[PDB]
Amino acid sequence: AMFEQMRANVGKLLKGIDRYNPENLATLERYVETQAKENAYDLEANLAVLKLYQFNPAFFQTTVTAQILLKALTNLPHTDFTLCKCMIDQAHQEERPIRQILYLGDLLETCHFQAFWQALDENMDLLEGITGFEDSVRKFICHVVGITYQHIDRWLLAEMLGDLSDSQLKVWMSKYGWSADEQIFICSQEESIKPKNIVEKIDFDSVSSIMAS
């Protein structure tokens, strides 16, 4: 569809210096919209957009920035969300609804899943166009669960996944191969003691890379 059709041109733009020309924002913003609708993704392009906004303040677009941040969150445990934050100055992070979105992201990063779903205005406008947003968040939660639990109450897992019906819960248990025993078996103890990072860490290389320009 549209994402695949724009992909080549955007990739070429990102390979050169035109990526620094704000005249190309109209094209990059439509690209972001397509990522949301088709549930496609391109971090490099999104960071380039944020960079263009930081360098050309008058072009700052609230909706596109919010979608970039929300999509970044759908990519946790990766460093996407943190990198985007590095590309938005304090003044803009403090503006509605960027402030609210960062707050929600904070709940996810700190793994307060119940609090996340509670604070999440389910009927939020920006979320409607972001296809698969809720399920993507669940994948991250299951990633964390697979690392931090050996066994877990069936009721608790459904709560953490956003208050799912038993039928919906079954979908996620099936996806990661979890099965009920007496509780849901997640991991053996000897396997659980292995240290596994919950979220990826940024470093000098990745950060200096985006800070270069």
UniProtKB/Swiss-Prot annotation:
Its main location: nucleus. It is found in: Nucleus; Cytoplasm. Signal peptide: none annotated. GO terms for biological process: formation of cytoplasmic translation initiation complex; regulation of translational initiation; translational initiation. GO terms for cellular component: cytosol; eukaryotic 43S preinitiation complex; eukaryotic 48S preinitiation complex; eukaryotic translation initiation factor 3 complex; membrane; nucleus. Pfam families: CSN8_PSD8_EIF3K. GO terms for molecular function: ribosome binding; RNA binding; translation initiation factor activity. Residues 41-201 form the PCI domain. Keywords: Acetylation, Cytoplasm, Initiation factor, Nucleus, Phosphoprotein, Protein biosynthesis. The modification Phosphothreonine is found at T27. PROSITE patterns: PCI. Ubiquitous, with the highest levels of expression in brain, testis and kidney. The modification N-acetylalanine is found at A1. Component of the eukaryotic translation initiation factor 3 (eIF-3) complex, which is composed of 13 subunits: EIF3A, EIF3B, EIF3C, EIF3D, EIF3E, EIF3F, EIF3G, EIF3H, EIF3I, EIF3J, EIF3K, EIF3L and EIF3M. The eIF-3 complex appears to include 3 stable modules: module A is composed of EIF3A, EIF3B, EIF3G and EIF3I; module B is composed of EIF3F, EIF3H, and EIF3M; and module C is composed of EIF3C, EIF3D, EIF3E, EIF3K and EIF3L. EIF3C of module C binds EIF3B of module A and EIF3H of module B, thereby linking the three modules. EIF3J is a labile subunit that binds to the eIF-3 complex via EIF3B. Belongs to the eIF-3 subunit K family. Component of the eukaryotic translation initiation factor 3 (eIF-3) complex, which is required for several steps in the initiation of protein synthesis. The eIF-3 complex associates with the 40S ribosome and facilitates the recruitment of eIF-1, eIF-1A, eIF-2:GTP:methionyl-tRNAi and eIF-5 to form the 43S pre-initiation complex (43S PIC). The eIF-3 complex stimulates mRNA recruitment to the 43S PIC and scanning of the mRNA for AUG recognition. This is Eukaryotic translation initiation factor 3 subunit K. It comes from Homo sapiens. The gene is EIF3K.
